[PDB]
Design a binder for this molecule. Sequence first.
Ligand SMILES: [Zn+2]
Length: 150
Amino acid sequence: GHPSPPPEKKELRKVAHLTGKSNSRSMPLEWEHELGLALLSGVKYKKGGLVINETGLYFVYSKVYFRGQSCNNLPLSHKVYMRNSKYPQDLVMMEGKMMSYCTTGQMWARSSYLGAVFNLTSADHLYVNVSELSLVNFEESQTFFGLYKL
Ligand SMILES: [Zn+2]
């Protein structure tokens, strides 16, 4: 019911830090958003997506820790994308790709980091995609997705 005065609106900071969730087969990725190192305040989480409720500038970031037991140079993409009524098709915001990154047969590991400033609108939905779910390690310190309002 009652609106929050801009002093009380501004005490509650708009922030998300979502951490890797190993027990999901989903794409886009699902995330931990309550316990451990995770944070969620003033932004909604649903089905792997961060759902913006206040229009404005935000810094958005994601790290993915890729690893495997036997290198075959399967290409590794990592993206942050958005869906809203203007881009019901998805808009890629940030993306990186690894090809020709390990020696064949060897145990391997490599991370990808994405971060940038975006102007987001209320009801924008933000997600993380990767090319090979099985080649992601989901420890909270290794694989993560977040943002904050500027
Ligand atoms: Zn009143």
